[PDB]
Homo-oligomer: A and B are copies of this chain.
Amino acid sequence: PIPKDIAYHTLTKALLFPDIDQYQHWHHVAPMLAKMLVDGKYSIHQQYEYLCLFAQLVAPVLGPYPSPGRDVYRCTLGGNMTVELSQNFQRSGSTTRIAFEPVRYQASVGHDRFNRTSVNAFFSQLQLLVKSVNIELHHLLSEHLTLTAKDERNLNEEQLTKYLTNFQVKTQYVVALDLRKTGIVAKEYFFPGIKCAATGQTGSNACFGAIRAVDKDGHLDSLCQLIEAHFQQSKIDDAFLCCDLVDPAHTRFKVYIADPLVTLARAEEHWTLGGRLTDEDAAVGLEIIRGLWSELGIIQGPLEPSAMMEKGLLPIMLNYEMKAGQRLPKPKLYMPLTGIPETKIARIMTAFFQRHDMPEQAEVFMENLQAYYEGKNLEEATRYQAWLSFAYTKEKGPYLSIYYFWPE
């Protein structure tokens, strides 16, 4: 009978990849991508549209295929790749997203180093296919949040070593495509860590400096003040920024942090900005987070990022979302799931969907997870579902995304 990934099998009979690495990225990503698009109820047409777009637009910027022991520029999306799938679950339905670090082979071979050009090459193709994508924020924010030529001359290798052992990747930019039924919306992430290593500034300062340069009037100013005071009280210096690649007036900004202390308490604190967020949605969500944290038994690692990376454990993360006319900043919790067995996570997620009146999601969650990882044993797997994001508004209800790691 007709396999779930028939669209991948079909396109494979028609596409000619110009090199082995694109080929390998296609056969590595497209199967699971095809399946998620079926699960999320995308039309057959929209399924081919986005698989084909993946082949044509994304595969060429995923870089050399990172076979074990191969000396190429490395990234950590999806665990060890330059690309990572994720899936959003809501009452209104499911949506697939694909995040990746644009990269070309020149970054592996001495001819870029901090990989600053590939994203520009990528946006120049993307904007041909999706007219709504506006890269004005890329041109505005790069200077504030990524390593300039002047920053690079003032860098020394003892400070780059120290950032790499703590954080691993030289990555400045990630891009993500939200594959919405109403058309792609592209998002860009900026990573100021290496810039900050060279300048002596903090990541948060850089991120809030970036926002204020773009927000000439100050509609986002009080929202910024609020988050900035929490970062200062909680002694947090590292941060990174995301934005929608749409007209600057209509974009949303999101400031990410990472805390290595994976306790519910530390999550509670960040979630409420230390008690500065008082809205009803934020209190209803906190009580849900308490239930999920407990049930999932999210694992406390150590603070040392050496021995945390050894055991394959991840920190907690949050982003605080800001938009022009927004009254309060909107929090989102990223809970780490590595070291938790995929059947356990499916048992909880299925019961969570039951509780919050999402029977369609509950009914198929497990069999879908199994088909993404066909043939594999989900009681023995711990590193397939890697993050669960959470957010809540009274109108739309619970917002949760699962971020997937590629199988070993």
Contact = CB atoms under 8 A, between A and B. Distances in A.
Nearest to A16: B56
Given A44-B44, A48-B48, A53 B14 contact: yes
A14 B45 contact: no
A48 B16 contact: no
Contacts of A7: 45, 48
Contacts of A46: 10
Contact of A13 (B10, B15, B44, B49): B49
Interface in A32-83: 44-46, 48-50, 52-53, 56-57
Interface residues of A, number: 21
A56 B15 contact: yes
A29 to B, nearest CB: 16
B129 A45 contact: no
A98 to B, nearest CB: 14
A125 interface: yes
A11 interface: yes
A128 interface: yes
A128 B20 CA distance: 13
Interface in A1-41: 6-7, 10-11, 13-16
Nearest to A13: B49
Nearest to A15: B56
Contacts of A129: 13-14, 16
A52 B14 contact: yes
Contacts of A50: 14
A13 B53 CA distance: 8
A331 to B, nearest CB: 35
B16 A52 contact: no
B16 A49 contact: no
Nearest to A57: B16
Contacts of A11: 48-49, 52
Interface string A188-205: 000000000000000000
B49 A10 contact: yes
Nearest to A128: B16
Nearest to A184: B13
A50 to B, nearest CB: 8
B44 A14 contact: no
Contacts of A16: 56-57, 125, 128-129
A50 B11 CA distance: 9
Given A16-B56, A16-B57, A53-B14, A45 B6 contact: yes
Contact of A14 (B6, B13, B56): B56
A11 B49 CA distance: 6
A226 B208 CA distance: 89
Nearest to A9: B45
Interface of A: 6-7, 10-11, 13-16, 44-46, 48-50, 52-53, 56-57, 125, 128-129
6 contacts: A6-B45, A13-B129, A14-B49, A14-B129, A15-B56, A48-B48
